[PDB]
Design an enzyme around this catalytic site. Sequence first.
Site, mmCIF file in Angstrom:
data_model
loop_
_atom_site.group_PDB
_atom_site.id
_atom_site.type_symbol
_atom_site.label_atom_id
_atom_site.label_comp_id
_atom_site.label_asym_id
_atom_site.label_seq_id
_atom_site.Cartn_x
_atom_site.Cartn_y
_atom_site.Cartn_z
ATOM 1 N N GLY A 9 0.771 -1.232 0.000
ATOM 2 C CA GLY A 9 0.000 0.000 0.000
ATOM 3 C C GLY A 9 0.803 1.283 0.000
ATOM 4 O O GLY A 9 0.191 2.342 -0.034
ATOM 5 N N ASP A 43 19.249 3.822 -2.327
ATOM 6 C CA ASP A 43 19.489 2.395 -2.200
ATOM 7 C C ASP A 43 20.806 2.155 -1.454
ATOM 8 O O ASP A 43 21.861 2.615 -1.946
ATOM 9 C CB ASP A 43 19.544 1.725 -3.567
ATOM 10 C CG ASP A 43 19.707 0.212 -3.407
ATOM 11 O OD1 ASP A 43 18.701 -0.448 -3.068
ATOM 12 O OD2 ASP A 43 20.853 -0.286 -3.566
ATOM 13 N N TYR A 48 27.998 -2.473 1.857
ATOM 14 C CA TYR A 48 28.675 -1.398 1.134
ATOM 15 C C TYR A 48 29.614 -0.606 2.039
ATOM 16 O O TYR A 48 30.449 0.143 1.519
ATOM 17 C CB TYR A 48 27.691 -0.427 0.451
ATOM 18 C CG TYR A 48 26.746 -1.081 -0.536
ATOM 19 C CD1 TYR A 48 26.963 -2.348 -1.054
ATOM 20 C CD2 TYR A 48 25.608 -0.416 -0.961
ATOM 21 C CE1 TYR A 48 26.091 -2.941 -1.958
ATOM 22 C CE2 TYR A 48 24.696 -1.022 -1.850
ATOM 23 C CZ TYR A 48 24.953 -2.278 -2.334
ATOM 24 O OH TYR A 48 24.039 -2.842 -3.187
ATOM 25 N N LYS A 77 19.532 -3.595 2.935
ATOM 26 C CA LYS A 77 19.581 -4.996 2.609
ATOM 27 C C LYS A 77 20.313 -5.768 3.712
ATOM 28 O O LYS A 77 21.365 -5.308 4.217
ATOM 29 C CB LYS A 77 20.276 -5.281 1.267
ATOM 30 C CG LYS A 77 19.882 -4.257 0.179
ATOM 31 C CD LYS A 77 20.389 -4.636 -1.193
ATOM 32 C CE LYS A 77 20.237 -3.515 -2.212
ATOM 33 N NZ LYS A 77 21.237 -2.435 -2.020
ATOM 34 N N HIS A 110 19.488 -9.573 0.743
ATOM 35 C CA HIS A 110 20.406 -9.104 -0.308
ATOM 36 C C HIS A 110 20.665 -10.165 -1.380
ATOM 37 O O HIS A 110 20.711 -9.861 -2.575
ATOM 38 C CB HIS A 110 21.677 -8.585 0.327
ATOM 39 C CG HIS A 110 22.511 -7.648 -0.483
ATOM 40 N ND1 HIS A 110 23.288 -6.697 0.158
ATOM 41 C CD2 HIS A 110 22.635 -7.518 -1.817
ATOM 42 C CE1 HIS A 110 23.899 -6.055 -0.832
ATOM 43 N NE2 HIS A 110 23.524 -6.499 -2.058
HETATM 44 N N1 LIG Z 1 21.111 -5.918 -4.955
HETATM 45 C C1 LIG Z 1 22.331 -6.125 -5.387
HETATM 46 O O1 LIG Z 1 22.918 -7.210 -5.306
HETATM 47 C C2 LIG Z 1 23.006 -4.980 -6.108
HETATM 48 C C3 LIG Z 1 24.141 -5.251 -6.930
HETATM 49 C C4 LIG Z 1 24.678 -4.245 -7.676
HETATM 50 C C5 LIG Z 1 24.164 -2.958 -7.593
HETATM 51 N N2 LIG Z 1 23.123 -2.697 -6.695
HETATM 52 C C6 LIG Z 1 22.615 -1.293 -6.493
HETATM 53 O O2 LIG Z 1 22.450 -0.700 -7.770
HETATM 54 C C7 LIG Z 1 23.218 0.508 -7.829
HETATM 55 C C8 LIG Z 1 23.607 0.832 -9.253
HETATM 56 O O3 LIG Z 1 24.456 -0.222 -9.809
HETATM 57 P P1 LIG Z 1 26.037 -0.054 -9.935
HETATM 58 O O4 LIG Z 1 26.585 0.809 -8.852
HETATM 59 O O5 LIG Z 1 26.549 -1.448 -10.052
HETATM 60 O O6 LIG Z 1 26.291 0.629 -11.331
HETATM 61 P P2 LIG Z 1 25.600 1.671 -12.369
HETATM 62 O O7 LIG Z 1 24.648 2.519 -11.642
HETATM 63 O O8 LIG Z 1 25.169 0.861 -13.540
HETATM 64 O O9 LIG Z 1 26.892 2.462 -12.845
HETATM 65 C C9 LIG Z 1 27.627 3.285 -11.897
HETATM 66 C C10 LIG Z 1 28.823 3.844 -12.671
HETATM 67 O O10 LIG Z 1 28.400 4.665 -13.732
HETATM 68 C C11 LIG Z 1 28.978 5.956 -13.632
HETATM 69 N N3 LIG Z 1 28.018 6.924 -14.050
HETATM 70 C C12 LIG Z 1 26.861 7.321 -13.388
HETATM 71 N N4 LIG Z 1 26.156 8.190 -14.027
HETATM 72 C C13 LIG Z 1 26.849 8.405 -15.191
HETATM 73 C C14 LIG Z 1 26.565 9.250 -16.269
HETATM 74 N N5 LIG Z 1 25.488 10.050 -16.338
HETATM 75 N N6 LIG Z 1 27.477 9.257 -17.290
HETATM 76 C C15 LIG Z 1 28.580 8.453 -17.236
HETATM 77 N N7 LIG Z 1 28.920 7.601 -16.232
HETATM 78 C C16 LIG Z 1 27.993 7.609 -15.210
HETATM 79 C C17 LIG Z 1 29.389 6.104 -12.164
HETATM 80 O O11 LIG Z 1 30.501 6.974 -12.063
HETATM 81 P P3 LIG Z 1 30.667 8.078 -10.874
HETATM 82 O O12 LIG Z 1 30.033 7.518 -9.632
HETATM 83 O O13 LIG Z 1 32.166 8.237 -10.821
HETATM 84 O O14 LIG Z 1 29.963 9.343 -11.389
HETATM 85 C C18 LIG Z 1 29.800 4.655 -11.812
HETATM 86 O O15 LIG Z 1 31.117 4.369 -12.291
HETATM 87 C C19 LIG Z 1 24.368 0.243 -6.856
HETATM 88 O O16 LIG Z 1 25.140 1.368 -6.515
HETATM 89 C C20 LIG Z 1 23.616 -0.417 -5.687
HETATM 90 O O17 LIG Z 1 22.930 0.639 -4.993
HETATM 91 C C21 LIG Z 1 22.545 -3.706 -5.996
HETATM 92 C C1 LIG Z 2 28.033 -11.098 -7.131
HETATM 93 C C2 LIG Z 2 27.874 -11.367 -5.649
HETATM 94 C C3 LIG Z 2 28.307 -10.561 -4.656
HETATM 95 S S1 LIG Z 2 29.146 -9.020 -4.849
HETATM 96 O O1 LIG Z 2 29.660 -8.904 -6.199
HETATM 97 O O2 LIG Z 2 30.099 -8.961 -3.730
HETATM 98 C C4 LIG Z 2 27.877 -7.855 -4.637
HETATM 99 C C5 LIG Z 2 27.959 -6.518 -5.199
HETATM 100 C C6 LIG Z 2 27.024 -5.632 -4.944
HETATM 101 C C7 LIG Z 2 25.926 -6.071 -4.112
HETATM 102 O O3 LIG Z 2 25.058 -5.278 -3.873
HETATM 103 N N1 LIG Z 2 25.896 -7.324 -3.657
HETATM 104 N N2 LIG Z 2 26.876 -8.182 -3.906
HETATM 105 O O4 LIG Z 2 28.053 -10.948 -3.419
HETATM 106 C C8 LIG Z 2 27.366 -12.125 -3.555
HETATM 107 C C9 LIG Z 2 26.903 -12.878 -2.485
HETATM 108 C C10 LIG Z 2 26.226 -14.043 -2.782
HETATM 109 C C11 LIG Z 2 26.070 -14.384 -4.133
HETATM 110 CL CL1 LIG Z 2 25.200 -15.828 -4.489
HETATM 111 C C12 LIG Z 2 26.528 -13.631 -5.207
HETATM 112 C C13 LIG Z 2 27.212 -12.466 -4.879
#
Ligand SMILES: NC(=O)c1ccc[n+]([C@@H]2O[C@H](COP(=O)([O-])OP(=O)(O)OC[C@H]3O[C@@H](n4cnc5c(N)ncnc54)[C@H](OP(=O)(O)O)[C@@H]3O)[C@@H](O)[C@H]2O)c1
Ligand SMILES: Cc1c(S(=O)(=O)c2ccc(=O)[nH]n2)oc2ccc(Cl)cc12
Length: 315
Positions: A9, A43, A48, A77, A110
């Site tokens: 919601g 996020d 991190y 997370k 996570h």
């Molecule tokens: N749940 C999970 O397991 C998980 C895993 C991965 C990511 N995430 C979340 O998703 C978020 C985003 O993913 P990500 O950090 O992997 O990568 P992303 O958002 O795909 O890319 C970040 C990169 O792109 C650059 N960038 C940002 N805006 C830009 C623009 N307008 N032009 C050119 N370059 C640009 C940034 O540089 P600068 O910062 O130097 O500007 C940084 O190097 C993470 O930070 C995290 O919060 C979650």
């Molecule tokens: C890939 C990977 C990662 S990570 O690349 O360290 C990552 C990056 C960013 C983030 O947000 N979470 N993890 O951690 C994990 C833990 C368990 C499993 Cl099955 C896969 C992975």
Amino acid sequence: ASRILLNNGAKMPILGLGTWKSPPGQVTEAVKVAIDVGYRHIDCAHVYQNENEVGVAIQEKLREQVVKREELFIVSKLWCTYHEKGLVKGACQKTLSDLKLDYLDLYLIHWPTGFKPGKEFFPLDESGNVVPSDTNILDTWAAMEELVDEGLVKAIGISNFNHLQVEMILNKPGLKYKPAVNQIECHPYLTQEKLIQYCQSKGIVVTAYSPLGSPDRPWAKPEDPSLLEDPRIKAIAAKHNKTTAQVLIRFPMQRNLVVIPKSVTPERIAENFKVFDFELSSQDMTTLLSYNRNWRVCALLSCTSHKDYPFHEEF
Ligand SMILES: NC(=O)c1ccc[n+]([C@@H]2O[C@H](COP(=O)([O-])OP(=O)(O)OC[C@H]3O[C@@H](n4cnc5c(N)ncnc54)[C@H](OP(=O)(O)O)[C@@H]3O)[C@@H](O)[C@H]2O)c1
Ligand SMILES: Cc1c(S(=O)(=O)c2ccc(=O)[nH]n2)oc2ccc(Cl)cc12
């Protein structure tokens, strides 16, 4: 519209700021700038190692009355070493304490994989394999449900769960709260059509992570594909008089996804938010979808023998 309605919601802003890899000495300013230029969703994650510094920014903007707490949507997370029932509440509370909050808007498991508890985020055996926990995802979910019932979090969800793992939760005996969100990697090289349709058909909102292809990921190899440099995407952006990043952010928005680009660069933080004033055509959308190659930023490659490793499955 700027927000999507969740199955609890509450409304969730479709654009948020990512914080993975944001250096602790830069992330406070990044989040301040983000809030100043309109972001209302951050996020976060304990793993991190920068939640304290994120929290300093949130608290300053609340104190300054730039925003009200009710207008913010803060996500964190539960890390893999805290899947045990008796550890979940303390993990959540540590995150709340660091972020300077009394509740989270959304708290995610996570990854589906539980690891041995302890100081190390990736506990290893002497041969280099991650040491699992025996705790199953269903018991970890029950512990997440308790956090809703204790007032610590408004919504709970999952991240990096494959279709069968989402199903497992949905089929949990005695399920009390459905997951609100599944946060997964998604971009033109990993389009995720099957998993997204499944989640959306069950009322679970999908958040797309790494939407720009995470050019700062630690394991980037120079030969890897590069979204931001793909001339085909650059051409769509030029047609619309937008940047390639703006196209990459708008793309998931038009699939009814939430998207969380990361930046610590003030100009890019502002750039990335300026995506509510143009539309990709259906032909643009299908063209972007056609670039799928099942390429992952985040494949948790050290955990591939874990019983719950999510990416052996087709989706
Ligand atoms: N749940 C999970 O397991 C998980 C895993 C991965 C990511 N995430 C979340 O998703 C978020 C985003 O993913 P990500 O950090 O992997 O990568 P992303 O958002 O795909 O890319 C970040 C990169 O792109 C650059 N960038 C940002 N805006 C830009 C623009 N307008 N032009 C050119 N370059 C640009 C940034 O540089 P600068 O910062 O130097 O500007 C940084 O190097 C993470 O930070 C995290 O919060 C979650
Ligand atoms: C890939 C990977 C990662 S990570 O690349 O360290 C990552 C990056 C960013 C983030 O947000 N979470 N993890 O951690 C994990 C833990 C368990 C499993 Cl099955 C896969 C992975």
